[PDB]
Amino acid sequence: IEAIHELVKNFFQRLGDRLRKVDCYHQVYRLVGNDGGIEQLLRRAEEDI
Amino acid sequence: AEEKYPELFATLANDLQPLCIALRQFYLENYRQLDSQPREIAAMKAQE
């Protein structure tokens, strides 16, 4: 259990860090004023997993 | 004078978004975190 928590936590943070550089993430943020709920959904999914 | 010149500003804004995006996210998380805590003394005292 202890190691699994670290594994999941490291993966999600790395996914998020690299997701903010691709065009798709900032093209929408360019088009609208909000993130669109990516972080809220991403956080909720991570906890459930 | 009409194509390359404006592109310099266009790329500048594209290179500024990656950091302006993080500052907004960081402040909102901290700001909304504090609002969760109660404000009135009566509610705060009961929590203790």
């Binding site: 943020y29 360019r30 004023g33 | 404006p6 500003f9 266009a10 804004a13 594209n14 500024l16 978004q17 302006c20 995006i21 907004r24 402040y27 909102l28 700001y31 909304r32």
Partner: peptide
């Protein structure tokens, strides 16, 4: 101010902050 400066020539807007609530 940055957005206003670019408003004259380019349409690439930035991300503002308002009504945090």
């Amino acid at each position: 101010s940055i957005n206003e400066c670019l408003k004259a020539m380019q349409i690439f807007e930035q991300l503002p902050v308002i009504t945090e609530s």
